[PDB]
């Protein structure tokens, strides 16, 4: 015997990785944080521009998820709308923790704190980012956790939850096996990853409150954001 994924699991992981790694110009966000104007308007513009590009990326990643096309079309839209917020926060946590130039963390925080976001929501946002950082996550972990977040059968209303469970279970199984292969000295690693998914769910309520605040302060969103975030 051995500790390896079976050939079908290696294949499934390969297409999740090929899809996840499809990132046009990853230096762009890094340079925007470092070089753009430091105004409340520019900071908000980075967020809507990055969040819009991310939704496009998320739909392309989602539609290629193993078995996603076997799903009822209303449940497909509900999974995408129900997971968009968590996926954005998980993706932000990934970029936050990447090897970035000196001062990037300080400049990014200076921007987040000048984006019309209340202090009440910045605290759990930074706490989550730091907890993600402590786990020292691989690209495989970020890609699989994102797929698991999208294919969640227990968050929002879904007509056929069993159909969604059946697509999520092999992803959870590939992820647990990768923790046994890549972190064998830490048997509680998988449970820590699942702990982070529990923490991710708190951002649904946080984001709903941030959106209400932005709308009150006459903030504009792109048609694609208005649709996925259900803005009126």
């Amino acid at each position: 015997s051995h500790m390896e994924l079976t050939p079908d699991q290696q294949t499934l992981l390969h297409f999740i990785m090929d899809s996840y790694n499809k990132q046009r110009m990853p230096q762009e966000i890094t340079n925007k944080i470092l070089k753009e104007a430091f105004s409340a308007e520019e900071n908000f513009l980075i967020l809507t521009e990055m969040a819009t590009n991310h939704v496009q990326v998320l739909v392309e990643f989602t539609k290629k998820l193993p078995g996603f096309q076997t799903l009822d079309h209303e449940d497909q839209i509900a999974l995408l709308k129900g997971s968009a917020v968590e996926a954005m926060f998980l993706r932000s946590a990934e970029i936050f923790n990447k090897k970035l130039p000196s001062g990037h963390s300080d400049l990014l925080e200076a921007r987040i704190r000048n984006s019309g976001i209340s202090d009440e929501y910045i605290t759990p946002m930074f706490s989550f980012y730091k907890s993600i950082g402590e786990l020292k996550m691989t690209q495989e972990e970020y890609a699989l956790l994102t797929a698991i977040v999208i294919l969640s059968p227990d968050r929002q209303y879904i007509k056929d939850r069993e159909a969604v469970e059946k697509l999520q279970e092999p992803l959870l199984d590939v992820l647990q096996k990768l923790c046994k292969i890549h972190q064998p000295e830490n048997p509680q690693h998988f449970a820590c990853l699942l702990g982070r998914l529990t923490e991710l769910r708190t951002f649904n309520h946080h984001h709903a409150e941030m959106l209400m605040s932005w709308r009150v302060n006459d903030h504009k969103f792109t048609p694609l954001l208005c649709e996925i975030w259900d803005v009126q």
């Binding site: 496009q56 739909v59 392309e60 497909q76 839209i77 709308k81 048609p223 649709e227 996925i228």
Partner: peptide, 10 residues
């Protein structure tokens, strides 16, 4: 709508 288009395209 936009999401349906992005989901059903190609």
């Amino acid at each position: 709508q936009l999401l349906r288009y992005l989901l059903d395209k190609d």
